[model samples]
Target: EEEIREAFRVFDKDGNGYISAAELRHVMTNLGEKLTDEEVDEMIREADIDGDGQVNYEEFVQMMTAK
Candidate 1:
């Protein structure tokens, strides 16, 4: 679960696992919600192992949960 926790930690500036556009954008400028659709998909494919379009709490939880 460390991987999942770490992933969240990277974007969780406020220490909250769940992140909003502002939070994610702050850390991931390139792949933030503001990015283009193609870029967004690339980022998700790399990080969003679940393949779900929306990177929700559990999706993030799983990535950060990894080793």
Candidate 2:
């Protein structure tokens, strides 16, 4: 699970358990995905299950595992 946790660490730039929208956006852009504002919004909406406007570790795990 270390690698999975490490991946989460990369996106959780503030050392918080959740990934902020800006952090996710930056990570995606760095990966050459170049998502637009609406796409980012849609991503957060889809992944943020707790409705806190951020993706926590649990949500991140689910997102990574989903097909």
Candidate 3:
């Protein structure tokens, strides 16, 4: 749980307690994976359970363990 929280923190980037598209894009870029705006939007859409257009820790955890 702690590690997962840390992972979320890393992804959050701005420490705003949510993952934004910009943050997601930055992370993907850092990983050397190029993603289009639509792809990023799709990822956020899939993980954004509350429809707030951001991935909070709860949603992130669910996404991480979804597989």
Candidate 4:
């Protein structure tokens, strides 16, 4: 859980409880994989369970573990 929280810290750049499209793009770019805008949207579409256009921690965890 600690590691998960830490990972969340890295993902949640602004420290919000959600990951926005911009954040995801930034993270991916930092990891050396630049994503297209459509790709980022598709990724969030897969995990944004609440339909808020952002990914929450539960969704984040689920997506990670589902892999």
Candidate 5:
């Protein structure tokens, strides 16, 4: 649990308790995914449970555990 939170923190970057599109892009790019803006948006769409346009911790956990 602690490890997952820490990993999510690293992606959250701004400590806002949510992963915004820009933050997700940065993390994906750093991982060499070469994803486009549309791709990133699609990913957020898939992961964002509340339809809030950002990924919260619970959503993040769902995404991780689903994989």
Candidate 6:
């Protein structure tokens, strides 16, 4: 849990909870888990809060927990 949360910190570079396409790509690349734009979209759709089309911090938490 702690480690995943820490990953959240890296992924959320802007501290927005939601990561832009580029941010997600960076995280995945760093983890050696290359991601496609479509895969990133699926992740965001599963986590985004308020349907605002962007993920917030809480959403980031949920995503990490999912792993």
Off by over 4 Å in 6: 11-21, 34-36, 45-54
lDDT (tens digit, per residue) of candidate 6 on 1-67: 6555566578775765566545544565565455566866677566643345444445554654676
lDDT score for residue 38 of model 2 = 88
Any runs in candidate 5 off by more than 4 Å, and if so which? 1-4, 13-16, 28-41, 48-53
What is the Cα-based lDDT of residue 41 in candidate 3?
A: 67
Flag the better candidate by TM-score, 2 or 5: 2
Of 4 and 6, the candidate ahead on lDDT is: 4
lDDT of 4 by residue, 1-67 (tens): 4555556669876877777656655555555444476865676666644457675665554554565
Instruction: Report how far off residue 59 is in candidate 4 (Å).
Output: 4.5
- Flag the better candidate by lDDT, 2 or 6: 2
Candidate 5 per-residue lDDT over residues 5-58, each given as its tens digit: 566679865877777656655655655445577865676667644456665665
Error of 5 at 17 (Å): 1.8
The global Cα lDDT (0 to 1) of model 2 is: 0.61
Taking the tens digit of each residue's C-alpha lDDT, what string does model 1 give over 1-67? 5544555577765665566544443444433225555664465567653443334444634443351
| C-alpha lDDT values of all predictions | 0.49, 0.61, 0.59, 0.60, 0.61, 0.57
- Report RMSD (Å) for each prediction in the order shown: 7.6, 4.3, 4.7, 4.4, 4.5, 4.1
Q: For model 1, name the residue pairs that clash.
A: 1-65, 3-64, 3-66, 4-63, 4-64, 4-65, 4-66, 5-64, 5-65
lDDT of 2 at 18: 76
Better of 1 and 4 by TM-score: 4
Q: What is the TM-score of each candidate against the true structure?
A: 0.32, 0.45, 0.40, 0.42, 0.42, 0.42
Cα-based lDDT at residue 19, candidate 2: 77
Ranking 3 against 6 by lDDT, winner: 3
For model 5, which pairs clash?
A: none
Candidate 2 differs from the real structure by a C-alpha RMSD in angstroms, to one decimal, of: 4.3
Cα-based lDDT at residue 25, candidate 6? 46
- Give candidate 1's TM-score: 0.32
Better of 1 and 5 by lDDT: 5
Q: Candidate 3, which segments miss by more than 4 Å at Cα?
A: 11-16, 25-41, 49-53
| Global local distance difference test of model 3 | 0.59
Considering every candidate listed, which one attains the maximal TM-score? 2
lDDT for each residue of candidate 3 in 1-67, tens digit (9 for 90 to 100)? 5555565579865767767655555655554445576865676666644456564665544554563
User: Which 10 successive residues of model 2 have the least lDDT summed?
Assistant: 58-67
